[PDB]
Protein backbone atom coordinates (compact mmCIF):
# COMPACT_ATOMS: atom_id res chain seq x y z
CA UNK A 1 0.00 0.00 0.00
CA UNK A 2 1.27 3.39 -1.20
CA UNK A 3 -1.14 5.55 0.74
CA UNK A 4 -1.09 9.14 2.00
CA UNK A 5 -0.16 9.61 5.72
CA UNK A 6 -3.73 10.30 6.98
CA UNK A 7 -4.92 6.99 5.51
CA UNK A 8 -5.59 4.02 7.80
CA UNK A 9 -2.50 1.66 8.06
Amino acid at each position, epitope marked *: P*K*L*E*P*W*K*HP
Partner: antibody, heavy 117, light 113 residues
Protein backbone atom coordinates in the same frame (compact mmCIF):
# COMPACT_ATOMS: atom_id res chain seq x y z
CA UNK B 1 -7.08 0.69 -19.70
CA UNK B 2 -8.40 1.85 -16.35
CA UNK B 3 -11.88 3.42 -16.78
CA UNK B 4 -14.28 5.34 -14.49
CA UNK B 5 -17.74 6.44 -15.76
CA UNK B 6 -19.81 8.50 -13.25
CA UNK B 7 -23.58 8.77 -13.45
CA UNK B 8 -26.56 10.20 -11.59
CA UNK B 9 -26.12 13.97 -11.70
CA UNK B 10 -29.01 16.34 -12.33
CA UNK B 11 -31.02 19.15 -10.83
CA UNK B 12 -31.82 18.90 -7.07
CA UNK B 13 -33.43 21.20 -4.56
CA UNK B 14 -31.60 22.62 -1.48
CA UNK B 15 -32.04 20.17 1.39
CA UNK B 16 -32.50 17.31 -1.16
CA UNK B 17 -30.61 14.10 -1.90
CA UNK B 18 -28.93 12.53 -4.91
CA UNK B 19 -26.92 9.42 -5.23
CA UNK B 20 -24.02 9.39 -7.69
CA UNK B 21 -22.53 6.21 -9.24
CA UNK B 22 -19.19 5.25 -10.64
CA UNK B 23 -18.79 2.18 -12.85
CA UNK B 24 -15.10 1.06 -12.71
CA UNK B 25 -13.48 -1.30 -15.29
CA UNK B 26 -10.08 -2.40 -16.63
CA UNK B 27 -8.54 -2.96 -13.17
CA UNK B 28 -8.92 -4.92 -9.94
CA UNK B 29 -11.34 -2.44 -8.39
CA UNK B 30 -11.41 -4.12 -4.99
CA UNK B 31 -7.60 -3.67 -4.53
CA UNK B 32 -7.69 0.22 -4.53
CA UNK B 33 -8.86 3.07 -2.36
CA UNK B 34 -11.33 5.33 -4.37
CA UNK B 35 -12.26 9.03 -4.12
CA UNK B 36 -14.68 11.71 -5.15
CA UNK B 37 -13.71 15.18 -6.15
CA UNK B 38 -15.60 18.04 -7.61
CA UNK B 39 -14.91 21.00 -9.86
CA UNK B 40 -17.04 24.07 -9.07
CA UNK B 41 -18.38 26.17 -11.96
CA UNK B 42 -15.54 28.73 -11.45
CA UNK B 43 -12.99 25.75 -11.85
CA UNK B 44 -11.93 25.33 -8.22
CA UNK B 45 -11.06 21.68 -7.63
CA UNK B 46 -12.03 20.19 -4.24
CA UNK B 47 -11.72 16.87 -2.50
CA UNK B 48 -15.02 15.35 -1.55
CA UNK B 49 -14.63 11.78 -0.10
CA UNK B 50 -12.39 8.66 0.11
CA UNK B 51 -13.03 4.98 0.94
CA UNK B 52 -10.57 2.15 1.74
CA UNK B 53 -10.24 -0.65 -0.87
CA UNK B 54 -12.22 -2.94 1.41
CA UNK B 55 -14.75 -0.30 2.44
CA UNK B 56 -13.90 -0.31 6.14
CA UNK B 57 -12.53 3.20 6.22
CA UNK B 58 -14.19 6.40 4.93
CA UNK B 59 -12.89 9.97 5.19
CA UNK B 60 -14.41 13.38 4.67
CA UNK B 61 -13.58 17.06 4.74
CA UNK B 62 -15.64 18.94 7.47
CA UNK B 63 -17.68 20.57 4.68
CA UNK B 64 -19.33 17.26 3.66
CA UNK B 65 -18.98 15.07 6.80
CA UNK B 66 -22.40 14.29 8.26
CA UNK B 67 -24.14 15.04 4.95
CA UNK B 68 -22.55 12.82 2.31
CA UNK B 69 -21.81 9.08 2.34
CA UNK B 70 -19.22 7.20 0.25
CA UNK B 71 -19.46 3.42 -0.28
CA UNK B 72 -18.74 0.67 -2.77
CA UNK B 73 -20.09 -2.60 -4.20
CA UNK B 74 -16.91 -4.58 -4.83
CA UNK B 75 -18.79 -7.59 -6.25
CA UNK B 76 -20.30 -5.14 -8.77
CA UNK B 77 -17.30 -2.77 -9.47
CA UNK B 78 -19.21 0.38 -8.43
CA UNK B 79 -18.44 3.42 -6.30
CA UNK B 80 -21.28 5.54 -4.74
CA UNK B 81 -21.80 8.92 -3.12
CA UNK B 82 -25.12 9.35 -1.33
CA UNK B 83 -25.44 13.10 -0.94
CA UNK B 84 -27.98 14.47 1.56
CA UNK B 85 -28.74 18.02 2.75
CA UNK B 86 -27.60 19.51 -0.51
CA UNK B 87 -26.82 23.22 -0.66
CA UNK B 88 -26.16 25.53 -3.61
CA UNK B 89 -22.43 25.36 -2.85
CA UNK B 90 -22.30 21.61 -3.72
CA UNK B 91 -23.17 22.66 -7.32
CA UNK B 92 -20.29 21.16 -9.16
CA UNK B 93 -18.99 18.66 -11.58
CA UNK B 94 -18.28 15.50 -9.62
CA UNK B 95 -15.45 13.16 -10.42
CA UNK B 96 -14.69 9.61 -9.35
CA UNK B 97 -10.93 8.90 -8.94
CA UNK B 98 -8.56 6.07 -8.02
CA UNK B 99 -6.15 6.45 -5.07
CA UNK B 100 -2.71 5.02 -5.88
CA UNK B 101 0.98 6.02 -6.01
CA UNK B 102 0.79 8.30 -2.88
CA UNK B 103 -2.21 10.18 -4.20
CA UNK B 104 -4.56 9.85 -7.14
CA UNK B 105 -3.74 8.42 -10.53
CA UNK B 106 -6.97 8.25 -12.53
CA UNK B 107 -10.01 10.51 -12.96
CA UNK B 108 -13.33 9.73 -14.56
CA UNK B 109 -15.28 12.01 -16.88
CA UNK B 110 -17.53 13.75 -14.40
CA UNK B 111 -21.23 13.96 -13.74
CA UNK B 112 -22.85 17.37 -13.29
CA UNK B 113 -24.86 18.38 -10.14
CA UNK B 114 -26.85 21.61 -9.70
CA UNK B 115 -28.53 22.38 -6.37
CA UNK B 116 -31.10 25.12 -6.89
CA UNK B 117 -34.74 25.78 -6.21
CA UNK C 1 -6.81 23.93 5.76
CA UNK C 2 -3.41 23.84 4.08
CA UNK C 3 -3.41 26.88 1.80
CA UNK C 4 -2.07 26.28 -1.71
CA UNK C 5 -1.14 29.37 -3.63
CA UNK C 6 -0.22 29.06 -7.25
CA UNK C 7 1.34 31.92 -9.28
CA UNK C 8 0.84 33.38 -12.01
CA UNK C 9 -2.90 33.14 -12.61
CA UNK C 10 -2.48 32.76 -16.36
CA UNK C 11 0.76 32.49 -18.33
CA UNK C 12 1.06 32.98 -22.02
CA UNK C 13 3.88 31.08 -23.49
CA UNK C 14 5.48 30.32 -26.83
CA UNK C 15 5.58 27.10 -28.75
CA UNK C 16 9.26 26.10 -28.50
CA UNK C 17 10.02 28.07 -25.32
CA UNK C 18 10.34 26.99 -21.64
CA UNK C 19 7.80 27.80 -18.93
CA UNK C 20 7.52 27.56 -15.21
CA UNK C 21 4.68 27.72 -12.69
CA UNK C 22 4.96 28.02 -8.95
CA UNK C 23 2.98 26.68 -6.00
CA UNK C 24 3.37 27.64 -2.32
CA UNK C 25 1.90 25.84 0.72
CA UNK C 26 1.03 27.76 3.91
CA UNK C 27 2.90 25.05 5.79
CA UNK C 28 5.44 22.32 5.14
CA UNK C 29 4.42 19.33 3.09
CA UNK C 30 7.27 17.17 4.40
CA UNK C 31 5.99 14.23 6.34
CA UNK C 32 7.67 12.62 9.34
CA UNK C 33 8.39 9.71 7.00
CA UNK C 34 10.70 11.37 4.51
CA UNK C 35 8.02 11.49 1.76
CA UNK C 36 6.47 14.76 0.45
CA UNK C 37 2.88 14.46 -0.85
CA UNK C 38 2.82 17.22 -3.43
CA UNK C 39 1.09 16.59 -6.77
CA UNK C 40 0.62 18.27 -10.13
CA UNK C 41 -2.30 17.75 -12.47
CA UNK C 42 -3.37 19.10 -15.90
CA UNK C 43 -6.92 19.72 -17.07
CA UNK C 44 -7.08 20.32 -20.82
CA UNK C 45 -10.09 22.29 -21.94
CA UNK C 46 -13.24 20.12 -21.70
CA UNK C 47 -11.27 17.03 -20.67
CA UNK C 48 -10.85 15.30 -17.29
CA UNK C 49 -7.94 15.94 -14.94
CA UNK C 50 -4.79 14.18 -15.92
CA UNK C 51 -2.07 13.25 -13.37
CA UNK C 52 1.19 14.91 -14.22
CA UNK C 53 3.39 14.62 -11.07
CA UNK C 54 3.39 12.95 -7.63
CA UNK C 55 5.84 12.96 -4.60
CA UNK C 56 7.21 16.30 -5.88
CA UNK C 57 9.05 14.97 -8.93
CA UNK C 58 7.89 11.48 -10.03
CA UNK C 59 6.63 11.68 -13.55
CA UNK C 60 3.41 10.02 -14.63
CA UNK C 61 4.44 7.61 -17.38
CA UNK C 62 1.99 9.02 -19.91
CA UNK C 63 3.79 12.39 -19.60
CA UNK C 64 6.98 13.43 -21.38
CA UNK C 65 10.18 14.44 -19.49
CA UNK C 66 9.87 18.00 -20.90
CA UNK C 67 8.05 18.41 -17.51
CA UNK C 68 9.97 18.22 -14.21
CA UNK C 69 8.58 18.88 -10.77
CA UNK C 70 10.88 20.11 -7.96
CA UNK C 71 10.87 22.03 -4.66
CA UNK C 72 10.74 21.12 -0.96
CA UNK C 73 9.18 22.58 2.12
CA UNK C 74 6.73 25.13 0.97
CA UNK C 75 7.92 26.01 -2.57
CA UNK C 76 7.46 23.91 -5.75
CA UNK C 77 7.90 24.37 -9.44
CA UNK C 78 6.56 22.73 -12.46
CA UNK C 79 8.69 23.52 -15.52
CA UNK C 80 8.24 22.77 -19.16
CA UNK C 81 11.51 22.73 -21.04
CA UNK C 82 9.73 23.34 -24.37
CA UNK C 83 6.01 24.00 -24.72
CA UNK C 84 3.90 22.17 -27.27
CA UNK C 85 0.34 23.16 -28.52
CA UNK C 86 -1.24 20.41 -26.40
CA UNK C 87 0.16 21.91 -23.13
CA UNK C 88 -2.77 24.38 -23.14
CA UNK C 89 -4.92 24.04 -20.04
CA UNK C 90 -5.12 24.51 -16.36
CA UNK C 91 -2.30 23.21 -14.09
CA UNK C 92 -3.18 22.56 -10.49
CA UNK C 93 -0.92 21.59 -7.63
CA UNK C 94 -2.35 19.67 -4.72
CA UNK C 95 -1.37 18.39 -1.40
CA UNK C 96 -2.20 15.18 0.43
CA UNK C 97 0.22 15.24 3.36
CA UNK C 98 -2.23 17.07 5.69
CA UNK C 99 -5.83 16.14 6.17
CA UNK C 100 -7.94 17.30 4.27
CA UNK C 101 -6.44 17.23 0.73
CA UNK C 102 -6.35 20.70 -0.71
CA UNK C 103 -5.75 22.23 -4.10
CA UNK C 104 -4.12 25.34 -5.44
CA UNK C 105 -6.34 27.59 -7.56
CA UNK C 106 -5.00 26.73 -11.03
CA UNK C 107 -2.55 28.33 -13.44
CA UNK C 108 -4.01 28.70 -16.89
CA UNK C 109 -1.50 28.14 -19.66
CA UNK C 110 -2.14 30.13 -22.81
CA UNK C 111 -0.45 30.17 -26.25
CA UNK C 112 1.11 33.29 -27.89
CA UNK C 113 0.34 34.24 -31.51
Amino acid sequence: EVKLVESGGGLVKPGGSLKLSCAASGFAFSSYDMSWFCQTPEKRLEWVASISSGGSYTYYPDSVKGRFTISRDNARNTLYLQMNSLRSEDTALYYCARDYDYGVDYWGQGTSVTVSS
Amino acid sequence: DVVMTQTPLTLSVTIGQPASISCKSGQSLLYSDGKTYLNWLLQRPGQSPKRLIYLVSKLDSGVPDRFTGSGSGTDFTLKISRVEAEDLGIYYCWQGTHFPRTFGGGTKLEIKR
